[PDB]
Amino acid sequence: MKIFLDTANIDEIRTGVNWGIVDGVTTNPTLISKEAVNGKKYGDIIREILKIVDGPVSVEVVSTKYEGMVEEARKIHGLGDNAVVKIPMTEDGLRAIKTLSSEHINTNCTLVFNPIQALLAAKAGVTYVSPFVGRLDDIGEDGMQIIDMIRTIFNNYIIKTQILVASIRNPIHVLRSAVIGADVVTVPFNVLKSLMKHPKTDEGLAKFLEDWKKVSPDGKLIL
Amino acid sequence: MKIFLDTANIDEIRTGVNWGIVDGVTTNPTLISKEAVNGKKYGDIIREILKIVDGPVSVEVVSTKYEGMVEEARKIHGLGDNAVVKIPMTEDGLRAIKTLSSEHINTNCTLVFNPIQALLAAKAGVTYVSPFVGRLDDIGEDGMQIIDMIRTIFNNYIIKTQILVASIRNPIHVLRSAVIGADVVTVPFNVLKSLMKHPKTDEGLAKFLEDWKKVSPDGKLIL
Amino acid sequence: MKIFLDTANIDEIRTGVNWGIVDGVTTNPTLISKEAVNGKKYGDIIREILKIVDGPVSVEVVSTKYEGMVEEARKIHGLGDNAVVKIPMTEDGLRAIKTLSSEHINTNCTLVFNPIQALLAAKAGVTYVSPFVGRLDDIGEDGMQIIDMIRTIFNNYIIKTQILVASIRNPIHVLRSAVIGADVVTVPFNVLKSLMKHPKTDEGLAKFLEDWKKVSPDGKLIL
Amino acid sequence: MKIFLDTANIDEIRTGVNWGIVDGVTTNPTLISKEAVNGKKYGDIIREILKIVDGPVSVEVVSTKYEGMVEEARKIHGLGDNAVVKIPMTEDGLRAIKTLSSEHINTNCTLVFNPIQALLAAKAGVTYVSPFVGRLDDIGEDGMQIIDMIRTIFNNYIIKTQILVASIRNPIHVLRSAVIGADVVTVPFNVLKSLMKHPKTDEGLAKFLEDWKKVSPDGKLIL
Amino acid sequence: MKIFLDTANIDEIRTGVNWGIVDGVTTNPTLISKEAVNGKKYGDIIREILKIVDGPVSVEVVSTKYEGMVEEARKIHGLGDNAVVKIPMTEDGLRAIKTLSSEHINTNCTLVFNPIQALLAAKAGVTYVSPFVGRLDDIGEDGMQIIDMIRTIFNNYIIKTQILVASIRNPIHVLRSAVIGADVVTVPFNVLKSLMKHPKTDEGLAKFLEDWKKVSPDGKLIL
Amino acid sequence: MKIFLDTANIDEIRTGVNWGIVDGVTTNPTLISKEAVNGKKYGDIIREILKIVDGPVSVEVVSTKYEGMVEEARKIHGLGDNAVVKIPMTEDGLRAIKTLSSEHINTNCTLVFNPIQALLAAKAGVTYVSPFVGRLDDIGEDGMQIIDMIRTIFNNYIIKTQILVASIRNPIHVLRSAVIGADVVTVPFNVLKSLMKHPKTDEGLAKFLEDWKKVSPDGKLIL
Amino acid sequence: MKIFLDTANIDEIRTGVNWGIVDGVTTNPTLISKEAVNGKKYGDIIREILKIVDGPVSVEVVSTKYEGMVEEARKIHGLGDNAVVKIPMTEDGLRAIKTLSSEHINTNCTLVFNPIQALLAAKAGVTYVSPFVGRLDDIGEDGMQIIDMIRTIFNNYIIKTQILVASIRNPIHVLRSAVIGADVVTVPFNVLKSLMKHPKTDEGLAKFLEDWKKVSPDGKLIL
Amino acid sequence: MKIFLDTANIDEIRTGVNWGIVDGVTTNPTLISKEAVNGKKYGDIIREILKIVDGPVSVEVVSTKYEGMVEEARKIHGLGDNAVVKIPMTEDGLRAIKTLSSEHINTNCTLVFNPIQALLAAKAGVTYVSPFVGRLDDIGEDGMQIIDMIRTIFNNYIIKTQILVASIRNPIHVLRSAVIGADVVTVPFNVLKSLMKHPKTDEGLAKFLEDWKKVSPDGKLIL
Numbered sequence A, B, C, D, E, F, G, H: 001m002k003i004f005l006d007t008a009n010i011d012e013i014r015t016g017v018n019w020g021i022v023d024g025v026t027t028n029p030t031l032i033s034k035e036a037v038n039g040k041k042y043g044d045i046i047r048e049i050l051k052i053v054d055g056p057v058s059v060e061v062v063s064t065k066y067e068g069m070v071e072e073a074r075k076i077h078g079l080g081d082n083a084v085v086k087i088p089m090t091e092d093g094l095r096a097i098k099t100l101s102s103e104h105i106n107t108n109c110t111l112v113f114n115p116i117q118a119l120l121a122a123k124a125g126v127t128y129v130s131p132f133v134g135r136l137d138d139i140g141e142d143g144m145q146i147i148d149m150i151r152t153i154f155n156n157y158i159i160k161t162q163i164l165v166a167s168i169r170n171p172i173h174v175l176r177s178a179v180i181g182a183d184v185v186t187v188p189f190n191v192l193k194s195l196m197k198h199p200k201t202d203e204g205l206a207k208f209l210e211d212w213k214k215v216s217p218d219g220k221l222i223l
């Protein structure tokens, strides 16, 4: 399972990249607009993320019509080979996806909330599809069930579109995605940092350290 | 999973095809005769649909006897290479499918209501088999269960007949078909149009566009 | 399981009532406004339905604010002891339900789409809660799964609110409701009439009558 | 589980009753037509069964209309206290059951092929409902699955109508009925006879006899 | 669960009874005739077992006809109040059980090989029913499954006939019977003797006694 | 799944073959005795079936001893390449199958009633094994459960012997066989006929015809 | 699944071998010492069994120490290429297995009572591992559960050691072994003979032969 | 499944190695510090284990910072080609593993307590990952569940990192690990010795020996 970071915050991205556990980044119009304040320009934010991240970087078109989507998509693609164009699940978007796919431009279909929307995006040739589990949880439906169904459907038809679990809110979304077999999760920075941690790791490390000092007061391993 | 449109209404068909999500069309004598009114001829309706749709188009014979079915089948085949001959599940129908298969004429066995009828159709060499889930629902039996058994039976024997789920009434027939692994669903226009939609898609798009205006008054993405 | 009719059509109501199988009626502002045409007044329609139907008749308030809802509820209540006041799942609706329940006015909480909404309506003292299965099916979620969870939750806490399955579209919503153990279903007229029917019932009756004529030429049963 | 004999053959009935294993009898117009030949009159056959059998005896009305059904039902009831009036699952049939129930005349709703028909019959106050398992098997649906659903539905609502499994064709219909918990099975004579038998019972008997001969040549147990 | 000893060997019976774990005894014509050799009379063997065992003692009739079975049954009953009359699962046997039950003579229906035979025996009013699990194992069917179905059937109908598992060959028949909830098992002496034993019991006792000697050379517990 | 006809009636065989749905035929000494009446000779009946049927035709030996079985088997094989020699599950039968297998004569082991008998037949190299589901149903055991176990065992060991389900009595034996994945079912003619039929197929046909009349009074499809 | 005979009795071995159903033989020091009576020598018995049985013949070492086991194993091996050396699950036994496996001497690890014992034997390179199901049943644990776990463990690691189910007591140990997918069962003679038998096979053969005599008075099959 | 010894005690390791059942060794700073007393130097201890054990030996770094971990790992590596460098699940630890993996130094990520930590370790390229089952048991969580999830996750993604079950406390951790399919278990000496033993093995050997004495007073096997 690949792990992407779901943010437009450059500091967060730089840190996660520096940890070596980030395989890519997702953005969306809300996340970018949060960061493009106090003289910060969105064009600069996007270019900076593309430069810092080796992996796929998803950038969302803002037009709602086919022609505008395809034109924006081409500009996003021109910004770098790791750019992936994020396109909403709408009639115009499926059309754009079909065109872009034939032009060999990688795509990510977003705002997906059920498995049949996901199947339609796959049939358009989308590179990634992004179901929003946390927004389903928000409305009282267990969003991970939709991921499970999408995994079964894609398996049934040997679908090559990657399932990119998005709207992730906690480490159990992550654990369940892995057990299901989702291709990718994209996680907010707070969730990312928690994934490596466990109180028994900390306690175990401390005890080992303590016991080692019994035989090596300096606390080092001399071999 | 292929998605076919189940109608003879040419306006619905043009619209569905323009959306890019329609892989084919199914008709039947009721659907055609609905449109073949007020001067409009059934011969014209059938030809027009064949011209419009790139994918398979199922057209049903009306004869109930072997020789008549085969004669009509061959006329249907002659109207275009994408024509598929719909043949009912009867003794004469199984005979006709077996002959037409040997003549390399694609066939669709219809009016199937249990898994053994579907197996017989596959043994006759039919290209598609069409079990009717909504008409079983109508008589108080969950029609989707028959689709599940057919998928199992076909998997057991490596059967190459495609399961074409028909008499579809709602998007959950479609979802369950995909999870089962049916090869094709054929859906009425109303159902078709709902498949791309979800209220959280609409709401999410609105929010993205409101947030974007904050950093781009004109609402565009200049890259 | 009680069976209500979901319509404001007096002819459908009179017909179903004469069948002896209708235990009540549910209406809503759309169903009523459909029938208040050609000079037909909504006040007359409502009174006429109350008169014809011995069982509970749900009538929806139209105000969206607490004070208006309770004022309308009290007027609805005064139309006959079989009137049930239908109130939507909103903040003010819950406040209204709690007030009306204390006044011993029967209530039906409507526009419920998940089990926690239903639980909150029950906690407010509502008489019936109406989850909308068909509208969930419309958006690619199996609506019956919500009924099953509500049944379990209500059983856990010995909740006396009745589950009234609404937005019913076919006889399998009805079958599944009964197997789950929902208290009530409300069904459109087309669905209601279909519930008694089965082709083997027809075929079986025909054969019995044929066989009887062999021993009783006039088809009589004289004892 | 009660066991009824499904026949109008007087010799079968006397024999089964005299096995001590038969708790009642079901007839229908076909079964009676079979016996009422060569001068034998249906009225005499019906009286004789009522006479010989202590348990319930179901006799079916032939009228298809409400008034005729109720008239014939009252005549059937008049022939003896053990008479149960068989009424088909139709609109008129349900109305008749409701009337007859209020008159304290026992009723058995027949020609039932799905669980919701069975529920409607129960809601009309019927004493027994009779789903036809064998005739569902005939059309490629496992009829015992409808018995299982009806048992669950009736348990859910604490329904007092008895489930009377009919159209029984083999001893496995009988076994599965008992494991499900159906109230009654009605069985043809040849199936009845088979229920007592097993090859290992026969072999075990023969061996006990052979071993006993060694200790007692005359095969008696003298105590 | 009652545990009966399945033998006519008087030495085995005295031993088992002295252990305190034998609640009753079952015999059959083979078991008795095995012991009734070299001068020993079957009448004497039967009487001696009745005297020795406080609990129920099953003794099988040899007659195959109703009148003879009943005559023998009554003689068996007269030998002592703890006598239980074993009657085979045959047409005449069911008749005999029904008569003997009305005479308050306890009965045990034997040579039962499926759950429907067991149900018929219970309907005749039998005190115990004895399905033969080992003889089903002998013919390649897992006999315990029949016990499981019988327990379910009896639970469904609140049947008071006790399930007496017979033809027991090993301690896993006994364990599975207990987990199922059979009322009684009857076991051959060899199987009986193994039930109390386990190698870890033996080893644990040895260790306890070795450890105790360390604080009590004489190996006693002076309190 | 292959479908064979289980009969020796030549009219049935010709009719089924001429439906195109029959892949072979099974006979046995009873079925043949039925036809070999009024001067009709068994040798002529067997030759005629071999002649008319392109697929396998099973013919059963009558000798009960190894030498007679092998002698008769070689004669049966000599009548045509499609002949399959039916051999019962006995000690001599297994020896015969082994010999005949080494001679490249196809064999079908019959009178199989549990999964281990089926395994022994497979180990002897038999071409088909025929478990008798209906005869197990007769003695109160669900015979389809043995087919399920045999399918699992044969899958486990990659066994090439084909499972040929026999003693079929109804269409549900057929459905369950297909869902399990049995290689072949052999069915009596009346069961064969029933497999193609369904009331909704008939009703659907009638309605299509009625609707088509409106657009084409003569009921033709002129293209 | 291979079937071995578990005995040292030459008559049983010769009989089973002549049946064609025995694939090998297992012995152990108890079985051999049973047969080495009346001046019969264990060396002669072993050689005679090796001579009669074409398949694997397991012969157990008697030394408890590593050096003695390997010395005895090498002598066993020299008696014929079909000899398999049976070695107990002990520390020295595992060491011996590892040594012998390297020398390409086939081995069978015996006295195995749990799945981890079996895994350790496999890790030492053993040819067969023999878990003792009947001896577990003796102590109140279902021995077949250990076979199932060993099958799963061996499948997980693609282990080539064969599971040889031993201490078999009845035909259900055999049936369950086949369903689990054990490689071999070894069975006492009484069990082996029972595997071919079933009362419905006998009854069925008798009826066929009776029916045939109606058309062939001499009971012949002349073709 | 590979089996490692979890200890730094040379006496235990030499014993396990001599038994032939030990495939490698794990140590940690606590285990080493326990042995490095009364004049024993941790450096001699590590070297001695490396020498005695043919297979992988895991030795943990003590540094908590990236540079120090990588330096220590290289020293550890240099001590012998069978050295595996144990590195804790921390930020610097994952960085170290990635660097060491690129240097072809085998790594083992320790102090893992949930499946997502295990996945992160795998993603860094670690050779083995060691979840601590016993320490989860200590805090009231069944540690084996985490192993099951890791197995599923690794299977989903065809992950080559080996699952090394650690903190093992009893033989059922070992059994469950094998049933799950973990790649390796590492076990304390007391557990390891227990794995070969079972009381029925001891009992069975004793009996075999007693019976062989009957045939060969001196207990030898002369062939």
Ligand SMILES: *[C@@H](CO)[C@@H](O)[C@H](O)[C@H](O)COP(=O)(O)O
Residues within 6 Å of the ligand: A006, A026, A027, A028, A058, A086, A108, A110, A111, A130, A132, A134, A135, A164, A166, A167, A168, A186
């Ligand atoms: C794009 C799809 O990969 C992502 O940036 C998604 O928009 C976010 O994961 C959505 O999360 P929220 O529900 O927190 O907006």
Ligand SMILES: *[C@@H](CO)[C@@H](O)[C@H](O)[C@H](O)COP(=O)(O)O
Residues within 6 Å of the ligand: B006, B026, B027, B028, B031, B058, B086, B108, B110, B111, B130, B132, B134, B135, B164, B166, B167, B168, B186
């Ligand atoms: C042909 C078979 O694929 C289709 O046109 C079917 O006839 C319809 O799908 C049947 O649907 P209705 O039950 O709604 O007529």
Ligand SMILES: *[C@@H](CO)[C@@H](O)[C@H](O)[C@H](O)COP(=O)(O)O
Residues within 6 Å of the ligand: C006, C026, C027, C028, C058, C086, C108, C110, C111, C130, C132, C134, C135, C164, C166, C167, C168, C186
């Ligand atoms: C009131 C709640 O019982 C009912 O009238 C509901 O509004 C309808 O059942 C809604 O159904 P639709 O989704 O078909 O409007």
Ligand SMILES: *[C@@H](CO)[C@@H](O)[C@H](O)[C@H](O)COP(=O)(O)O
Residues within 6 Å of the ligand: D006, D026, D027, D028, D031, D058, D086, D108, D110, D130, D132, D134, D135, D164, D166, D167, D168, D186
């Ligand atoms: C009445 C209902 O209890 C019965 O006589 C039923 O009509 C028969 O059981 C129906 O069986 P068939 O399908 O064999 O007519």
Ligand SMILES: *[C@@H](CO)[C@@H](O)[C@H](O)[C@H](O)COP(=O)(O)O
Residues within 6 Å of the ligand: E006, E026, E027, E028, E031, E058, E086, E108, E110, E111, E130, E132, E134, E135, E164, E166, E167, E168, E186
């Ligand atoms: C009487 C019924 O409880 C018993 O004695 C049975 O006859 C035996 O239990 C039958 O056992 P076998 O199959 O071992 O004879």
Ligand SMILES: *[C@@H](CO)[C@@H](O)[C@H](O)[C@H](O)COP(=O)(O)O
Residues within 6 Å of the ligand: F006, F026, F027, F028, F031, F058, F086, F108, F110, F130, F132, F134, F135, F164, F166, F167, F168, F186
């Ligand atoms: C041969 C095996 O393929 C078949 O003819 C079987 O004998 C019959 O199918 C047995 O069926 P019955 O139980 O009806 O004789």
Ligand SMILES: *[C@@H](CO)[C@@H](O)[C@H](O)[C@H](O)COP(=O)(O)O
Residues within 6 Å of the ligand: G006, G026, G027, G028, G058, G086, G108, G110, G111, G130, G132, G134, G135, G164, G166, G167, G168, G186
């Ligand atoms: C050797 C291992 O295959 C066999 O001879 C076993 O020793 C026997 O199967 C043991 O059976 P018992 O528990 O009946 O002695």
Ligand SMILES: *[C@@H](CO)[C@@H](O)[C@H](O)[C@H](O)COP(=O)(O)O
Residues within 6 Å of the ligand: H006, H026, H027, H028, H058, H086, H108, H109, H110, H111, H130, H132, H134, H135, H166, H167, H168, H186
């Ligand atoms: C290293 C594998 O990472 C091992 O030595 C583990 O530290 C031990 O297996 C941990 O066991 P405890 O929980 O008993 O310390």
